[PDB]
């Protein structure tokens, strides 16, 4: 029990779903009933790879073997759903947590804000933060980062200033993720004065090494063959808290680069993430489907993903080219086609390949291009400002 749970935790931490599945099969093949904690590690790994179907099967199997889910199990699902913006499934857990006798802790509130944010529900995201303070609790550093992303996403420059300065008002030294979100909201409004003001703060950074290297590489100082090894050195050091922290770091970084005009640099940063296992669902290239999955990405990251995907399309035929913007129960509804990600991807595709990618009549969160229309198709310019 101790060895099985130890290995599965590592698989769930690093998002190695294939290894986690084999440990579960090995335990069953030896007539061993895995513990409730062991299944939670398997559920964690599937959520790291956006394999929601296999994650909910393991959750279903927990009750079958009598290993009822613990509080940590309902957190593995919430963080898995939060990254994809599946607030419909997040509310199912929340409506289940109140019935299961589990009070809402702080971690539950953070996932709720993150799920609503990624799902485009900006009004409901701040309401959770509004209702969180009424219930007392104690917002942590990620909660401040959770609500800062909401304001940064909906282009609130003055709200983002107040949120960001208060982070350092308590001598917290906000992480590199919050700095990259400041660059996005300043880069979205073309506020080039504030961008240079924040960059000089990240250039000195005598205390934190990651801010210095990442801040330097954004400006383009580290774009040399030998000078890209230092940037890679930081990425390998950050590639030790698992895929959970990595996806948050790359989403903010690509968002900052795209809004600052460093669109060619964002292409190489995304290429650095994929080889490290980040965004394993991003691309599929077989004879049937050529797909790009952007439901767990930021707006800047999605644009970078589409730009590379479109350029690679023109190089080469599959039966279909699809863009997965909504991946959940919201697909079977009209709300998915009104999602901010779905509209942004379609708007991005409209003025890059003319009217070649149209919606689907059978799914709200898909943007397809038939094989016949693929014949009638760089397509996107990737340059640094």
């Amino acid at each position: 029990m101790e060895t099985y749970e130890g290995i599965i935790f590592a698989c769930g931490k690093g998002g190695l779903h294939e290894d986690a599945r084999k440990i579960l099969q090995y335990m069953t093949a030896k007539d061993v009933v895995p513990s409730s904690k062991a299944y939670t590690g398997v559920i964690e790994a599937f959520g790291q790879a956006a394999l929601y179907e296999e994650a909910l099967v393991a959750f279903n199997t927990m009750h079958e073997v009598g290993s009822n889910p613990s509080i940590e199990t309902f957190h593995s699902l919430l963080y898995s759903f939060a990254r994809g913006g599946l607030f419909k499934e997040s509310e199912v857990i929340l409506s289940r947590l109140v019935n299961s006798g589990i009070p809402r802790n702080r971690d539950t509130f953070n996932a709720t804000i993150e799920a609503y944010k990624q799902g485009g529900k900006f009004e409901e995201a701040v309401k959770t933060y509004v209702d969180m303070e009424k219930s007392r609790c104690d917002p942590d550093e990620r909660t401040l980062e959770a609500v800062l992303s909401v304001y940064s996403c909906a282009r609130l420059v003055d709200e983002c200033r107040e949120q960001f300065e208060e982070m350092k008002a308590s001598d917290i030294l906000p992480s590199i993720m919050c700095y990259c979100m400041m660059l996005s909201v300043y880069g979205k409004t073309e506020s080039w004065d504030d961008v240079n003001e924040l960059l000089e703060e990240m250039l000195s950074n005598r205390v934190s090494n990651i801010h210095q290297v990442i801040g330097q590489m954004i400006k383009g100082n580290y774009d040399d063959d030998s000078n890209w090894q230092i940037v890679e050195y930081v990425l390998d050091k950050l590639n030790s808290e698992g895929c959970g922290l990595g996806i948050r770091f790359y989403n903010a970084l690509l968002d900052a680069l795209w809004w600052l005009g460093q669109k060619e640099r964002a292409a190489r940063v995304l290429n650095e993430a994929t080889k490290r296992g980040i965004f394993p669902e991003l691309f599929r290239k077989n004879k049937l489907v050529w797909s790009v999955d952007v439901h767990r990405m930021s707006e800047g990251g999605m644009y970078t993903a589409l730009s590379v995907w479109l350029n690679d399309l023109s190089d080469i035929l599959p039966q279909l080219a699809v863009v997965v913007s909504v991946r959940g129960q919201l697909e079977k509804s009209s709300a998915a086609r009104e999602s901010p990600i779905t509209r942004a991807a379609f708007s991005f595709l409209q003025d890059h390949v003319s009217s070649s990618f149209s919606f689907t009549g059978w799914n709200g969160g898909r943007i397809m291009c038939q094989r016949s229309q693929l014949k009638q198709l760089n397509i996107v310019a990737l340059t640094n400002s």
Binding site: L56, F59, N60, T61, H63, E64, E89, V92, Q329
Partner: peptide, 17 residues
Amino acid sequence: GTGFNKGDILFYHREFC
């Protein structure tokens, strides 16, 4: 006379919805 001739799958496997 009357003595003659000796007289759970499909559970916990539903749609999450």
